[PDB]
Amino acid sequence: CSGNLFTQRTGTITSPDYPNPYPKSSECSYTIDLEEGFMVTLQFEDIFDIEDHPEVPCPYDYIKIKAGSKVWGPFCGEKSPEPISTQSHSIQILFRSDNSGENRGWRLSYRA
Ligand SMILES: [Ca+2]
């Protein structure tokens, strides 16, 4: 999972094993790298199941998305963020899980 470069203008990224449980203690990243000027809308499709908490924001596990200075997330829980219009050509999706949990992960489809 660590060393995903995406060079095509549309595509689809998922948590390892999605929709099986994603592995524990996992520092997985995903890069979308396209020519500057391309503009990337990210959509979460299907089931967003990242481990969550009732009272405290997204400890444990989480997807973060970084472009330029802009940083979306960290996200977790059973409901995915609304589509993200990054207005960027180069996004780092970072996903991170701790050492326990039984969540099935996430799935996004990008396009530019
Ligand atoms: Ca976990």
Swiss-Prot record:
Disulfide bridge positions per record: C1-C28, C58-C76
Binding residue positions for Ca(2+) 3: E51, D61, D98, S100
Domain (CUB) ranges: 1-112
Protein name: Mannan-binding lectin serine protease 1 heavy chain
Species assigned in the record: Rattus norvegicus
This protein's encoding gene: Masp1
Whole sequence portion shown: 190 to 301 of 704
